């Protein structure tokens, strides 16, 4: 099936925010949907579960207060409700289904993508996208690299495709980096041939969903 | 609680080659229905954990018979037969038989190939970015194995510190290699004020290190 | 002491076949027997699956099993059912 969750949240320290997770192409009320918290380079914990067919729940005890889970049968959807948020509940959010009759006692037998929560007072901020030329000082054999320098931005996520999609072969996208600012900020690179460098136009498609920001910048040789 | 512990935490492993991982329970986990809920997920890079195994031995549907579970009371091991590139990224194991659940630690699998010396690549600030008042220089080093590399910058032959930041992407499963980006962010008169503007690596693929540079205009 | 509430489904239908499956929900204690029967004789371990006896989130718990059989022959087959004491014996709907 299909397991849409929304996406990334920023909020303020102290309220809640209610993460959904839509689905799909299967027997929604046959199914336990979990939640699982997975801080960016650290393991995962459990949260909780709910049997969608009951509403009835299991609840880690260290989330008791902090998270409600909550399901809508009509339009096969689960809800976790998050409340008196800190900035240690900054974290990747999934919701994963026990397909109960399909795989019997199998847990997290499909996820979803995941929601980025960012909890922090800073306000929202599009990111500033600036050109890495392709030159002689880029240019290794007969293959060159070029790229977009994609600065500035609260919060996490940023995504780069390159000519609208069309372009992922010899793609590097890179983790962004926490600034002392505040801030993020992240490369996004691609080695082409030295000899399409005339002919072939390149652009970087910049989206930041968080701030309603897209950005696209042409990358020429200098 | 149970306390879950993997072993290795890092899986340096050849092609082809046999991978095993270890996960130490603290206590027994065999549910009071009498399963034993120990699950095996492998989350690659910059995808969410996919299930491999289930009930301690059961493999999931479309994972390959290389892909094999065992163990019994407090000791527990995937093994894998035959490792592909496909294969790279985080393993966790996980007990779902006694409250509150618990995942392991992580255990790391890359794959262990021929060592590649990265193309080194530098890019001057751009014009637009100037004119807002810094300079950010960034120094490109792609698709080298292994990961450990160093990147020093210098400007005319003074070596920086405290003013660039690095990232390095997880492995790639295409060809088993790193890029790494190493960002000078200066401002634009203390950009203005020098001419050699140098990215210097060092690697064990390089005979010697490798500097790439220009002059400003 | 809560007793089931057995349902059985059909599923899966083709080449003359179909898939039928015992559920039983809502019980308490944990502890329960449910077995296929053809012509009263349980079905082979190795021709039936089973679902886990995990809980509802409300105090009570759930588990199944399903089998494959002929179109035809649904009268033949009945799922035994047996919790604290009761037991009780379930037909195929057709």
């Known amino acids: ?222 | 609680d149970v306390l879950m512990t993997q072993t290795p935490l890092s899986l340096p492993v050849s092609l082809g080659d046999q991978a095993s991982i270890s996960c130490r329970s603290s206590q027994h986990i065999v549910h009071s229905n009498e399963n034993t809920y120990l699950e095996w997920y492998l989350q690659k890079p910059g995808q969410s954990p996919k299930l491999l195994i289930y009930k301690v031995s059961n493999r999931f549907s479309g994972v390959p018979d290389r892909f094999s579970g065992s163990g019994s009371g407090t000791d527990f091991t995937l093994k894998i037969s035959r490792v592909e590139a496909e294969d790279l990224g985080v393993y966790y194991c996980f007990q779902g038989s006694h409250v509150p659940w618990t995942f392991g630690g992580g255990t790391k699998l890359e794959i262990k190939r021929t060592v590649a010396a990265p193309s080194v690549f530098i890019f001057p600030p751009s014009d637009e970015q100037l004119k807002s008042g810094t300079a950010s220089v960034v120094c490109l080093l792609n698709n080298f194995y292994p990961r450990e590399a160093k990147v020093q910058w210098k400007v005319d032959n003074a070596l920086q510190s405290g003013n660039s930041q690095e990232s390095v992407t997880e492995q790639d499963s295409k060809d088993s290699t790193y890029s790494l980006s190493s960002t000078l962010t200066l401002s634009k008169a203390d950009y203005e004020k020098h001419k050699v503007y140098a990215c210097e690596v060092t690697h064990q693929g390089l005979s010697s290190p490798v500097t790439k540079s220009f002059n400003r205009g | 002491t809560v007793p089931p509430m057995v349902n059985v489904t059909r599923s899966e239908a083709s080449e003359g076949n179909i898939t039928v499956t015992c559920r039983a929900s809502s019980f308490y204690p944990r502890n329960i027997i449910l077995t296929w029967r053809q012509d009263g004789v349980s079905l082979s371990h190795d021709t039936q699956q089973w679902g886990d006896v995990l809980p509802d989130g409300n105090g009570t718990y759930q588990t199944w099993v399903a089998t494959r059989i002929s179109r035809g022959e649904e009268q033949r087959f009945t799922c035994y059912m047996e919790h604290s004491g009761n037991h009780s014996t379930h037909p195929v709907p057709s």
């Not at chain 1, 925010?17 to 009320?29: A, E, N, Q």
């Not at chain 1, 289904?97 to 019997?104: K, L, P, Q």
Request: glycine fraction near 10%; charged fraction near 15%.
């Open chain 1, 1 to 222: 099936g299909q397991m849409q969750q929304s996406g990334a949240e920023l909020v303020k320290p102290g309220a809640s925010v209610k993460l959904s997770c839509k689905t799909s192409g299967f027997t929604f009320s046959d199914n336990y949907i979990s939640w699982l918290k997975q801080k960016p380079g650290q393991s995962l914990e459990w949260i909780a579960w709910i049997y969608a067919g009951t509403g009835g729940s299991s609840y880690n005890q260290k989330f008791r207060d902090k998270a409600q889970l909550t399901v809508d049968t009509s339009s096969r959807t689960a809800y976790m409700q998050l409340s008196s948020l800190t900035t240690e509940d900054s974290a990747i959010y999934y919701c994963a289904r026990h397909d109960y009759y399909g795989t019997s006692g199998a847990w997290f037998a499909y996820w979803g993508r995941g929601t980025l929560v960012t909890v922090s007072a800073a306000s929202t901020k599009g990111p500033s996208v600036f050109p890495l030329a392709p030159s002689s000082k880029s240019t290794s054999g007969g293959t060159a690299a070029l790229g977009c320098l994609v600065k500035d931005y609260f919060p996490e996520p940023v995504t780069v495709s390159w000519n609208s999609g069309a372009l992922t072969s010899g793609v590097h996208t890179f983790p962004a980096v926490l600034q002392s600012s505040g801030l993020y900020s992240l490369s996004s690179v691609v080695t082409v041939p030295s000899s399409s460098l005339g002919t072939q136009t390149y652009i970087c498609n910049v989206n930041h969903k968080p701030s309603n920001t897209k950005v696209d910048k042409k990358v020429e040789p200098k």
